[PDB]
């Protein structure tokens, strides 16, 4: 069967392929190139774990210094097939997850987006919140809504660890009888889809959730 | 070391009034005595022999407000004491100062009596005693403190005691607010509802 890889893994594969290729573009020493070729080849193999003939063919094209961006795209498209898409919950199930928010509305998510979505997040302007649904290490769907800043600033996003247009996201603790509550949050990309594509490690997102 | 939760729930579990309220109003008006506490209280499950023995022991504890450890020690004393263990056990609980104050009518409830005893409002033989577990011997005189006589609660409690049946073994005087433990209560004097044998059996288990 075709290898199954997580979306964050595919993003890493894309990044390493671009990194691997950029070496061919810049590095003039074959020796240095070779060292990186092996490193990247191993990394791609490691993610797949087992490499089929189709992966091997792609790897062969990747190893060649005459690799082209058009060829890279084709290789990525093949690798995209190996990726497994994020499972959308049933609309009923979603409402069960967001019990507090009655009649929660979900926008249509692109299948490709789902395929590359480590987590799914959607922003409602009326809410002024970002609704994030994701499967944890336990693989239970976890849904959380927190206030998203209307102001957008350029800074490193906590989730993806990449510099992008970020808006502060705050998650409120359950209100006590006194009415006291604690909000903990960090700057994150306003666009979840962009952040998903940027994210190469599932753990980084998990860490952000831990901070909340 | 005391139960500070809802009183009527305990009565509802037993399905009988445990005299955990003054009795100014009917228990039925206050709560649904018939129905057991909680969501599944309305349904009545079949009770095992162990369950029946347990519930009897729990009833008595809830009436006298004694925790299990102290109740176990009473049982052991009752077993050590000569005669009927079950009757001895009931006599020991009756012997408690807490019960005596309530029975004399100084306290509306045994919990109220406990606060009176605890707060040094009770004197036994002219000496202040603040132990609820204190055992009142025959011929002992339990008198409220002179300072405590002025308290409104004591007066109201005595009126409620008039409505209740007067214990034969206790002689009390209103106004004077003193009482004498003439004799240790006989089993006949105590309510027949309590089944002492079940408690004795449970501890033999």
């Amino acid at each position: 069967m075709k290898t199954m890889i997580y979306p964050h893994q595919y993003n890493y594969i894309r990044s390493v392929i671009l990194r691997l290729k950029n070496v061919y573009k810049t590095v003039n020493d074959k020796e240095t190139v070779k060292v990186i070729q092996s490193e990247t080849y191993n990394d791609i193999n490691e993610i797949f774990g087992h490499i089929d003939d189709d992966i091997e063919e792609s790897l062969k094209v990747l190893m060649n210094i005459r690799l082209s961006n058009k060829e890279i795209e084709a290789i990525l498209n093949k690798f995209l097939e190996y990726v497994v898409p994020f499972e959308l919950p049933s609309p009923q199930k979603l409402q069960k997850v967001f019990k507090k928010v009655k009649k929660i509305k979900i926008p249509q998510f692109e299948e490709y987006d789902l395929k590359v979505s480590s987590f799914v997040g959607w922003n409602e302007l009326a809410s002024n919140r970002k609704y994030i649904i994701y499967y944890d290490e336990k693989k239970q769907l976890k849904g959380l809504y927190g206030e998203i800043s209307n102001q957008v600033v350029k800074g490193f996003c906590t989730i993806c660890n990449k510099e992008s247009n970020v808006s502060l996201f705050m998650k409120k603790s359950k209100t006590n009888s006194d009415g006291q509550y604690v909000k903990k949050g960090d700057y994150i990309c306003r666009d979840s889809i962009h952040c998903n594509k940027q994210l190469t490690d599932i753990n980084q997102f998990y860490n952000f959730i831990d901070k909340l | 070391a005391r139960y500070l939760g809802p009183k009527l729930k305990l009565s509802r579990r037993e399905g009988t009034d445990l005299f955990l309220k003054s009795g100014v109003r009917a228990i039925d008006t206050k709560c649904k005595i018939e129905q057991a506490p909680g969501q599944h209280g309305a349904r009545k499950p079949r009770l095992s022999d162990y369950g029946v023995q347990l519930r009897e022991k729990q009833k008595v504890r809830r009436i006298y407000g004694v925790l299990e450890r102290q109740f176990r020690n009473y049982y052991k004393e009752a077993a050590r004491l000569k005669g009927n263990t079950g009757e001895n056990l009931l006599a020991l609980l009756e012997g408690r100062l807490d019960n005596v104050v309530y029975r004399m009518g100084f306290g509306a409830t045994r919990a109220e009596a406990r606060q009176l005893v605890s707060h040094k409002a009770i004197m036994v033989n002219g000496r202040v005693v603040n132990i609820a577990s204190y055992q009142v011997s025959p011929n002992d005189v339990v008198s409220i403190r002179e300072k405590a006589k002025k308290q409104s609660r004591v007066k109201a409690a005595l009126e409620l005691a008039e409505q209740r049946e007067k214990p034969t073994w206790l002689e009390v005087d209103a106004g004077k607010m003193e009482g004498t433990f003439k004799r240790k209560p006989e089993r006949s004097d105590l309510s027949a509802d309590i089944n002492e044998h079940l408690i004795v059996e449970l501890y033999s288990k």
């Binding site: 240095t32 060292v35 600033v153 906590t158 604690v182 903990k184 949050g185 | -």
Partner: protein, 214 residues
């Protein structure tokens, strides 16, 4: 443009009180907010410490919004405030005078008071850099990292190539490629990844503040 951020070096408890007449209506908002340093990467943390009757419940969210906006604005060079915990330990109000805006202004005033006593410091982004080059040019690479104020954590040899791992400020990192090509004679490659935000050198920080001032 390096995306510098600000944080409070020292924890401080401050009271922000606003009292003024606007449009023929008196406006009075008082908030006593404690600002403390937060763990790196923790982000902004707000705690409501109002039991009640000291701040109107409606104005509390507005107070939080004011603080959030003020953090975005920045207190020093205008860089977004990060790694700060805000706690509304005390407050005072007048029913008629108190308004959402007034309390929001008061929160801003409190944060200004905090900024005075919190010893805020600018934070520069630090990028972890892995450089692969021949051992011959390794000494030159070491020098370049030192010049850029970067510190080399460790050095790892892979075959003929030598791998250097160092943390360099992003500002210093710009133009590393051209230098690397010159140092290695185009025989070396590098990869940089953001790690954390670290305090700017005081001398540099002062200059940055002056630059943003004018």
């Amino acid at each position: 443009m390096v995306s510098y951020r600000e944080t409070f070096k020292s924890s401080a408890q401050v009271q922000g009180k606003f009292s003024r007449q606007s449009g023929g209506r008196g406006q009075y908002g008082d908030v006593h907010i404690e600002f403390t340093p937060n763990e790196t990467g923790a982000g902004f943390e707000f705690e409501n410490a109002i039991v009640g009757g000291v701040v109107p419940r409606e104005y509390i969210p507005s107070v939080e919004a004011g603080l959030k906006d003020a953090m975005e604005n920045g207190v020093l060079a205008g860089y977004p405030l990060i790694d700060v915990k805000a706690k509304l330990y005390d407050g005072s109000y007048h029913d008629v005078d108190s308004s959402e805006m007034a309390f929001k202004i008061a929160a801003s005033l409190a944060l200004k008071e905090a900024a005075k006593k919190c010893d805020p410091v600018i934070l520069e982004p630090m990028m972890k850099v892995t450089i692969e080059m021949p051992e011959e040019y390794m000494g030159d690479i070491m020098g370049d990292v030192t010049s850029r104020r970067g510190r080399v954590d460790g050095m790892e040899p892979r075959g003929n190539a030598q791998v250097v791992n160092a943390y360099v400020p992003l500002s210093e990192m710009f133009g590393y490629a051209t230098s690397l090509r010159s140092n290695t004679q185009g025989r070396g490659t590098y990869t940089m990844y953001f790690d954390h935000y670290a305090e700017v050198p005081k001398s540099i920080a002062e200059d940055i503040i002056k630059k943003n001032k004018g």
